[PDB]
Symmetry: D2
Subunit: 131 residues, 4 copies
């Protein structure tokens, strides 16, 4: 699975976005160790605090299906450069993804940036901290 | 698809729960107008505010797949009586479900309580209030 | 302090709102049993899921100061009728407020609707269920 | 009001923490440019998603009071090394704090780690992207 295919999935996932309030659509595609792909998109709500992001939707669909081993995650939005995952999403990524998972960031014009789960949120807060 | 079958789906969904911090597992099963079922469970995080709930997981899974028409949602947890959806979930339910969708609440001992969206969240805040 | 005076505080609190994304400002004023008032407003973020609501701001401000016994909460927004608290806020209210606390809902034109935590959120999920 | 004094504030703020579910208390102290200090702590809820964190209570209290100019933020928890702000909080920090605000992380052992807002969350998602 070369990142380009996963990116293609994230771009399709982005079209399923329910973002009538921000008008900002985000798509994500998660690749399991066994090669299965899970798509995700942001889903908004009139009461802003309830909004769920693309990265999390993809991860939560996988986990709720029994898939917890991942190798790559692609995220795409219509930004000048590769889209930047928000802090909350990086946190969820650091919790559900091993530190070696590859995070592929992109947009709708071919700009790509890659980084590991660790580099995305260095020294992330974790279950270990809770002693 | 009877409600008793949906309940069994929610119970199965509950086993996929990732609740290592609260140790409280919740499951949910959403039924589309076309008879398709989407399972959901709660997925926690070391940083508590990140946690996603079973009801929301099922709905987000459905919506991210293109299914936006629903008829029934079942929720189950190991509580004294039927499990009670939290306020945040009721809000997401009132936004993504039509006012007629049937919400089936239950537990691990056959106790069942049924109700509609409006009854679940009286005069819910909505997109209408944003003009 | 009557509800009219608490409402005056919620309306002032509303002006502190940081809602550049939705342009929808909400204010709230919480009255403790000892008569102290805590103001709250919604504070938004470019990443939508981080948004904090007025009702919650007022409640969190109070609790983080050591005040945990309340008697009344007022909420105001620019809606045609009294503003309706969202489900997440109703949940936080049911957890931090006793079932008797009076919830005063209003807008910017004098319309007022009053109600209890229980009718605000029917058989709310609670710590008992854990 | 040097940093050691802000750290003390965050430590006191930590005692106000309402964390009956995780038993993990966190405190934070925000210093405005005018020298005013705002305390924050984490406040949990039976329904885990509602939980508010210490860093966010302090910033929300400040903003809801009209203070939006800050210079330093201290955060403390009972961890082996300085406490690490979660991603959600770093996001809120990057939105409400200027890139030059100093973030002071510590624990109960005097171990201190300092860093800037930009360093805490490099190339953070922002309003410009919308
Ligand atoms: O991490 C990224 C940054 C934020 N967006 C969101 C939430 C909201 O629906 C929209 C505007 O912020 O994009 C995402 O979905 N993922
Ligand atoms: O609406 C219901 C009530 C709350 N639970 C959650 C989230 C958390 O992981 C656990 C304890 O609140 O159950 C749900 O998943 N759904
Ligand atoms: O529960 C109420 C209804 C919604 N608003 C919010 C959050 C957001 O900044 C804006 C749009 O939903 O109003 C509140 O602050 N409280
Ligand atoms: O950013 C930090 C990390 C997480 N904690 C929280 C929320 C929760 O109540 C508890 C356990 O994670 O500490 C904070 O309050 N701030
Ligand atoms: Zn995000
Ligand atoms: Zn819920
Ligand atoms: Zn609310
Ligand atoms: Zn945090």
């Amino acid at each position: 699975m070369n990142r380009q295919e996963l990116i293609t999935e994230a771009l399709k996932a982005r079209d399923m976005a329910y973002a009538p309030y921000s008008k900002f659509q985000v798509g994500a595609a998660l690749l399991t160790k066994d090669g299965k792909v899970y798509r995700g998109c942001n889903i908004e709500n009139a009461a802003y605090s309830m909004c769920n992001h693309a990265e999390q939707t993809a991860l939560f669909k996988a986990v709720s299906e029994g898939d917890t081993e991942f190798q790559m995650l692609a995220v795409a939005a219509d930004t000048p450069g590769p889209v930047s995952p928000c802090g909350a999403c990086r946190q969820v990524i650091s919790e559900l993804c091993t530190k070696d998972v590859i995070v592929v960031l992109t947009n709708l014009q071919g700009q790509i940036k890659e980084m590991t789960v660790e580099e995305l949120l260095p020294g992330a807060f974790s279950s270990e901290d809770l002693h």
